[model samples]
Target: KQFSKYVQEKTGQNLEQLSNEAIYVQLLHFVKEAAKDMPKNTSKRKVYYISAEFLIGKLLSNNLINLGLYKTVKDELAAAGKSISQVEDVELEPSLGNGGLGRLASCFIDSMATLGINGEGVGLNYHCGLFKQVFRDNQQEAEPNYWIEDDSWLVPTAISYDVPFRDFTLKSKLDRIDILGYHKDSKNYLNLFDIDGLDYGLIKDGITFDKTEIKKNLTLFLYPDDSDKNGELLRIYQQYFMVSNAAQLLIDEALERGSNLHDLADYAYVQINDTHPSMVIPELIRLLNEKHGLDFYEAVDIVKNMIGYTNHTILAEALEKWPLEYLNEVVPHLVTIIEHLDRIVRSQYKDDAVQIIDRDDRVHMAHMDIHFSTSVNGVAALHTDILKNSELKPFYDIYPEKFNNKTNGITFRRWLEFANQDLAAYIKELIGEGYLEDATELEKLLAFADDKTVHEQLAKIKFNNKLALKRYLKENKGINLDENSIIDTQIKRFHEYKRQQMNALYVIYKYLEIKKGNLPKRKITVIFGGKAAPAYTIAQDIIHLILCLSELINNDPDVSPYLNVFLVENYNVTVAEKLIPATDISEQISLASKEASGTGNMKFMLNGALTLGTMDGANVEIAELVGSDNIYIFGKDSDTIIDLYDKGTYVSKDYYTNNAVIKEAVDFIVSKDVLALGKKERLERLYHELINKDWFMTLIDLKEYIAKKEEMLADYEDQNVWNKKVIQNIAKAGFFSSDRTIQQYDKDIWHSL
Candidate 1:
């Protein structure tokens, strides 16, 4: 009634006459007014979650759900003849991140606020976030997702700082979005820094940019196609800009709170999400020494005490290393400080392996953070162990006590309660609402494991979600889907090690079997959703193969009855919200030791999807909690995979030659049917590359992967047994809640709450 009254007064229209866009406007106003009236938390020991990206998707629904306004607003809108879903559809989803790491930062902020911790996220306001993916002729296309609306959630603030780069200084203004916590009065913020009077010099064709325009285009996009030196330099420019402003913001806040420069650690701590914001360390040190007139060593110490690092992945490419010349050209002032920091490490440690500046004269950003930060953590139990023993052994050996693991987790409020409302409500009826307040209380669900009614209800919710997804894809993309078919989903950022190709090979096997008149017991739909890095050719080729296969399999009359493949276009958080609840099989099939920690696996588990995964990342923990029967685990263990890589013994060609099924699947990539839709060169290149240079060893686990997948399919024929696995997954997913992960961060590293 409050929303209806407010909308009626503001828009001069009754509910039936109000447009969806107008309703959204009224909702935004009401939310802002409520936020303005809310009291703020005054905690000295605040946490600044510094990340380069915060993949905060569409905020309207999540914000309303968190503030406990969703149900009331929905009822009011129903009485007024306006659909809440229609109003939600008018909101834009900000693609401020590319993949899991950015989404992780967003989840952590939600947990921090819900836990009532004094924490805020700080990053850049990218005019064009990551590229919007499109498919043309079965190839991935990139376009700028210009998502900022005139009436935006980002409120401009008067706070400004002069961020100095090598050539010039730019004044940056802070813009903020209030991140409301679930049933909490205290709201945290995501502070986005942007240049004042910035000109986005016409992003040509949404992607192309002026090669030489530095100031006008530096912050135009997040990770601006760093496939060449110019793009790399622009990235260095953007990184320095973000950190310099962050450094100034921190110092100014400390001074306002009447803190001496020496007590900066007592006032606040900054958690570097990864090496993207690593320059904040050196920039903060430079400020302490130059602006505050502290000694260099003292500045380093104070900054170290206030900084912590979280390593997201051990992937060599993901670990950032900047060329010396690039930094020298971009952030010349910080070069001296970086050199000093390097010198200290070099003089103290004889092991050149752990040095800040490597032998090639590039600055290893993670090395600097690991050496100087008070704490360093990996995202999962297995990942951290591997880090301490294998990846960062030298640093771990030196600062053994500094290493720890906070296994990654997902926020159930957004992932389950809001996204899968039917399932959430059903669970509440069975186990009470205590799980909403305490995630671990979800364990009580195990008591209903044997109840036939509970299992049937779980299966019904999953089917209903599938119907919703079926309708969504049909309406949005013109893709038809069967609600009865099993949904095997493999969604993430397209990377070789993550092995979307492995899943593709299984699809090939299924296609061939269907062609041979071998039918499955149940109809199956394999869904693939993700965007490859625009610069990565092989990843794009893999995407092309999937898209081509999708066209072939989804269109064929004979195959369409038994099986179908769908490559969802432009996959993002919005798509994830639709797909996860309906997923029957969660594919966490990354090669062992490659994935640092998979948050998707957790999200799927919470929403009642059984995992078909390798023994890697959080899968190890999930297997332990649910036992082996509930989840399917296949492929080589991490140590074996690592040792094979060490010895260079596992060759892809040998597997292709030796295993007939592997050869058949590998050859299917270049089959004439696929070549008809995709480019001959692209298809052949992928075939040759996979057989000759499978660096991630997809073929090593190919046979076992196929076997396990088939086994899961056969087991799915038993409805009672399959539904029990779903119950077990949900019963054990409480441990993977971001609330627990955030609490662990506070207990170990941040210590802010």
Candidate 2:
């Protein structure tokens, strides 16, 4: 009855008119709680998590659980003649972000609030969120995400603030210089830096800065990924929109609040999530020195104190570096400021003599963000190590004190406690449910790791969850699944770097080896999940290839009896609950050094899936927890891959010569007679890569992976041993919770509640 009333007031509709509205009301209760004594109790050091995307899903159950009202609300709703589960399902999961990086951002925010940390997220209000996924003959396809058209959930704060719409126009008032970009998409200003005998080294005492409220457009929707990298002028608009918007908003907020403008550091912090916001570093300098007329060195010092950065990837493609000409045309004044700062800093140290702006018309945003920010960090332990030794080494050498590792984490509340209620109840029975309050209490689950009864229960729960998934698949996609088989899943964005093709190739080899030789068939179902970026041809091909193999294996009388293959379509937050809980093995077989820390690997382990992963990304960390005995690890180390690359001595062609299984699988997939559905280009893509680039080392990792996979299958036959490892994985996953991640981030990066 209360839920009905709440929904009626929010959307002017009774419960039957719309159920998502009820979820919105539930969130308001959580928001009320979030804005309460928790701040006072925890010392109220507010944390502003600045990110470009937050993959926030349906908020009702998540909010109810966080507010400690899950059971209460569920019972009340049932009494009111509505099934809580059915009502909650009415809300669409917002496909608001891309892969791991954006998901990590959402996880951190969720954990922060759940753990009672004073954290709030600031991100774009993209017109369209991440694309919606589908399947055509088991191959993944996507269409525009139009969920934002409905606005029953999000709070509208835009009416409370003014957003500027203008372009740049230079102005001078006697001794003052104003580098103004006052108009949007339609004006110009002088491109000059005031360098009047100012040395940055002379004023090494750090600078203080003030906060400002940016105009409306800066916080527009997340930047969409389009393949034509050269034509992405929207990126420049977004950078300036965020930087200028933040600049004006902070300045206005400071003056209105009566905070001392001179003591900016005492009241403000402008954290840039990645290079997309790096322009704020220079914009702050321009605001202080050029507009407000502080000394150049003082302006630079102030900016350094007020900014912090977190690097998400070592992948060059993901990093944003604008063409200098474009940077100058758009934010000309800020461009000059960057050059001036670069010269002063470069002159101070002979070793840093190379230009900060790279040749062939690009700027090194990674270096720029790190150089200007008060602090810089990598997303994981291995990634941070690489930042120190490779990519960001020059900046690290100069500012060793600034570099640190805040290994990324996932929110256990969403991924574990809330998503998998069935599993959570099982875990709580052993650990006393205190783990729900603080993830570290998960160590209590370790007491039952050696308990045979506990292991048996864990395995049985997994089997049941798999059966539930099979029913859903049959209803949704007309695909049947094998609940009795070992469920091995490798899901995320379909990519060559993720090596989905290698997984398919391995499946081919397993099938061929079984049919040709006398080796007995193993009961296994290799599951594939996630969507391919529409324009990513190779990724799409990998999906198509997997489906072809799935059809081939599932239909064959011999392969069907033993091997099962299923490609779960539209994998999102909801699917994650079903998939992660049901998983027996997680495949993390990316080439070494290619993947950033994968949060999914952690989610899988926490759900009790033994990892069959490579020694890369967070897989190494997973190996540390599950130990060498319980997990299956294969593939070369980062050093080995780097050494092989540097010597130019390794070739995928050599692998084809050495491995008989690989050659057969490759030939089978590409042969016109075997897989007639494959296009010439699609078949040739893999063939060419095998003979040429092999950049991701798919072939190199293939042999070792197959060997380990077979060994895992044998182990799976012993349900007792299999369940024991599953229980151990669950017991050790306590520390990997996003709750732990939030606490670590609160203490380290935000240094807040």
Candidate 3:
């Protein structure tokens, strides 16, 4: 009643006349006002999480849920003719971050607030976020995605800082989104810095712009490009802008809290979210030496004590190396400071591999972070092991104490409670509300695994979720689906190593089976959702292949009934929320040792989706937790894959030559129908790439992956057995909760006061 009255007051319309847009505006006003009354955080120690992106999705629902007003407000809207979902759909997801790295930072801040830790996320407010992905002529196209609305979640602030670069100093202002804790009196901020009154030139092709327009596009886009020198220099500019502002913000906050320059560590700690923000190591040091009049070594020690580094991937492209010339051009002020730090590392460590400056005179950002940070950790156990043994072996050998593993996790509040309200309510009724506070309480569901009623309830919830998803697709994409069909989904960033191409091959194999009249007992819907990097040719080709496969399979009457494929366009957090709950199979089939840690696997597991994966990343840990009976694990383990790479003898052609099934599937990529749908060049290039140069070993695991998938499908026909597996997955999923992950960080690394 109060919300209805409030809506009427704000929108100047009664409940009967209110539109979805008007309701959304009212809710936005309500949430913004609620944010004002949030209790002040008085914790002495705070964490400043610095990242290039903070892929914070839509905030309306998450904020309401955290504030404990979601159900009340939802009920109020339902009382009218309006639906909360309709209102939610009107709010656009802010593409502040891309993929796992960005989403992980977002999840961490939520957990920190829920755990009552003082934490702030520092990042750039990208105007044109990591391009809006669109398909044109069966090829991926990049376009600007503008999401900032008039009453956007980002609230402008009077706080401003002057971010310095070699060319010029730009005045910047801070905007913040208040991240509230779930039913707690605690709140945190994601402080996004931006330059007001700056003119951004029209970005041609989503990322291309005049490189010389430094002030115009200092914060226009996140990681504008990854392939050229201009893009590289632009990145240096973005990094310096982000960290310089961050350092200034941090020091200013410390001063406000009555801190002297010497005890800066007591006031704040920074988590370097990947090497993108590693520039802060030098930036912080420079500020301390130049601004606070500290000795260079003393500044280094103090800065080291205040920051920690988290390595997200072992992929070489991700471990950024900036050429000396780029740094000299953009941030020459920090060159001498970086040189001094490199010299110190050179004197201490004789190995070239451990040097801050490599033989090419490039600044190895990760190497610098590892040397200067108080703690350096990986996102998963296997990823950490790989780091200690291989990727950062030299640094690991030098400073064994600095290395540790904080296996990646997701927030169940968003993945479970907020995503599937039916399941959340059912679980709450069965286990009480204690699981919300301690995710470990989910294990209590294990006792009811054999109970027929419990199993049926689990199945019913999944079916309802599937029905919701079916409606979502029909409304949004104008595509229909069989709600009863098995939803086999693989959604993540489009990377060769993560193996979307391998999954696409499995789809082709299924198409062949349907065509041969060897159809399975139940209908199967293969769903692919993700975006390729604009520059990656093969990844774009894989996207083309998947879209064309969708076109071919779904349009054919013979194959459409038994097997169908749908590639969800513009996959983001909003899509993930809908798809994960309905999914039966979670595809984590990255080549062994390639994926650092996959948070998607955990989200799907928490939502009762079974993992069909190789033993890699946290899948190694998930396998141990759920045991062999629960998850369908196939493919060569990490050691063998690493050894194969070491030997360089496992050829893709050998698999294609020896295996008839492999040859048939590889050939299908360029088949007449497929070729007619997609570009001939793209299809043939992909076919050759698969047959001759499958770098991530798609061919190596094809046969085993198909067999295991078939076995899993057959088992899904048994209702009780499948439901029991689902229960076991949810029971073991508690360990992967971000709350637990945050607790470990507080205990082992942050030690927040």
lDDT of 1 by residue, 104-186 (tens): 98999999888888888899998778888888999999888778887878877899988888788888888888888898998
- Candidate 3 Cα misplacement greater than 4 A, ranges: 198-201, 205-207, 315-318
Give model 3's TM-score versus the native structure: 0.98
lDDT tens digits, residue span 46-156, model 3: 789998988888999998998889999888888777788888989989979878889999999889888888888999898878888777787788887678888888888
* Residue 683 in model 1: lDDT: 93
Error of 1 at 128 (Å): 1.2
Error of 3 at 184 (Å): 1.7
Error of 3 at 288 (Å): 2.1
Per-model TM-score, in order, reads 0.97, 0.85, 0.98
What is the Å distance of residue 415 in model 3 from its true position? 0.7
**Each model's RMSD to truth, in Å?**
1.7, 10.1, 1.5
For model 1, the run of ten residues with the poorest summed lDDT: 196-205
Best by lDDT: 1
